[PDB]
């Protein structure tokens, strides 16, 4: 939920009340009675909690940030799942033994360099959540360095389909591709369904890019296509404008018609939101509020 | 921390003090007394004690 780990290190090892040992500029801010909200609040403390603050502010203490700088590292390693969460009580029990064994002027200044690049040079972790080359760009640029670029029929639409497929894994942060076994896959979401067999799809689409099929043929592709190729073309449909594969290829009978099939449900869901909200507006059997509703929409 | 600086006295108010009576006189069944409770000068009295 947080952005930075060192703020949680500054939340688990700093005093919540204002002390002059660490925040002098706020502890002296209220001794001299110069504060906007509640100014006159330090005279009326007795000699117990005046001298226990007014001595320690005009000459500060000299504490040791060794126990605090390591929590800005041990947290920064468990935020990125390098360590198990069940385990950080051991490594801080081992790093604090480490940097007190080999302590110097250098290591106290070398940890302090390392609690800055886990703050402002950990912006790469903010970066490839957006560009998602975790598993979407550099894991697919091996796939595009695997397919043959010499297709006999349809030389131009072959390199515009994968030009529209690299855009698919780029405009979606959740989708990713990977190497499992001798073939590459592609899931549209983490914790997600609809895994396409990406090797067994472009091998099915090879020798298929030029057909120029007529518009009176529907039930032939049970022995020609494969339903995951029929689902990969479903996942390429919203990111494919009308200028990719124009009109008369058999993919124009597929990719354009898949956008119309998505174009049905992206307005009939708004119809389905109306019907399920008027069954309780007039009084309708909720068991029979979905049987006849779906049959009108399928 | 049990506060100081104008919570308690600095100045020897007597903690409790015996009043003396004056003008007492009798009847065969009854009995009068009189006192001058002279709470005075920067002190209070609570009258339950």
């Amino acid at each position: 939920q947080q952005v930075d780990p060192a703020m949680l290190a500054a939340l688990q090892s700093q005093p919540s009340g204002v002390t002059p040992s660490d925040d002098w500029a706020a502890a002296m801010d209220r001794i001299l009675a110069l504060t906007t909200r509640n100014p006159e609040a330090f005279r009326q403390q007795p000699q117990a909690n005046r001298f226990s603050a007014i001595l320690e502010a005009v000459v500060p203490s000299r504490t040791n940030p060794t126990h605090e700088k390591v929590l800005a590292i041990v947290n920064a390693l468990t935020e990125s799942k390098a360590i198990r969460k069940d385990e950080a009580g051991l490594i801080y029990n081992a790093l604090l033994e480490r940097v007190a064994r080999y302590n110097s002027t250098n290591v106290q200044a070398n940890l302090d360099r390392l609690t800055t690049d886990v703050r402002e040079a950990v912006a790469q972790r903010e970066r490839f959540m957006h560009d998602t080359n975790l598993g979407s760009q550099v894991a697919l640029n091996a796939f595009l360095s695997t397919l043959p670029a010499n297709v006999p029929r349809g030389q131009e639409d072959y390199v515009s389909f994968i030009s529209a497929l690299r855009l698919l894994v780029a405009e979606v942060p959740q989708s990713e591709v990977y190497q499992s076994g001798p073939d590459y896959f592609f899931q549209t979401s983490r914790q997600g369904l609809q895994t396409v067999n990406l090797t067994q799809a472009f091998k099915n689409l090879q020798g298929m890019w030029g057909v120029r099929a007529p518009v009176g043929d529907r039930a032939t592709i049970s022995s020609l296509l494969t339903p995951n190729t029929r689902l990969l073309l479903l996942l390429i449909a919203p990111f494919t404008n009308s200028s990719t594969i124009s009109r008369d290829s058999y993919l124009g009978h597929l990719i354009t018609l898949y956008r119309e099939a998505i174009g049905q449900t992206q307005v009939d869901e708004q119809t389905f939101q109306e019907i399920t909200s008027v069954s309780r507006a007039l009084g309708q059997q909720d068991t029979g509020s979905l049987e006849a509703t779906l049959n009108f929409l399928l | 921390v049990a506060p100081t600086h104008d919570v308690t006295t600095d100045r020897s108010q007597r903690l409790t003090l015996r009043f003396v009576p004056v003008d007492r006189e009798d009847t065969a069944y009854s009995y009068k007394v009189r006192f001058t409770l002279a709470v005075g000068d920067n002190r209070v009295l609570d009258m339950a004690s």
Partner: peptide, 29 residues
Amino acid sequence: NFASLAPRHGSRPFMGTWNEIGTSQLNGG
């Protein structure tokens, strides 16, 4: 504020509840 009169638990003075200013002790009240 009158903070220099309350016996402070720490830095915060011990300021009581709001029923500690009056009383309503009648026979059946």
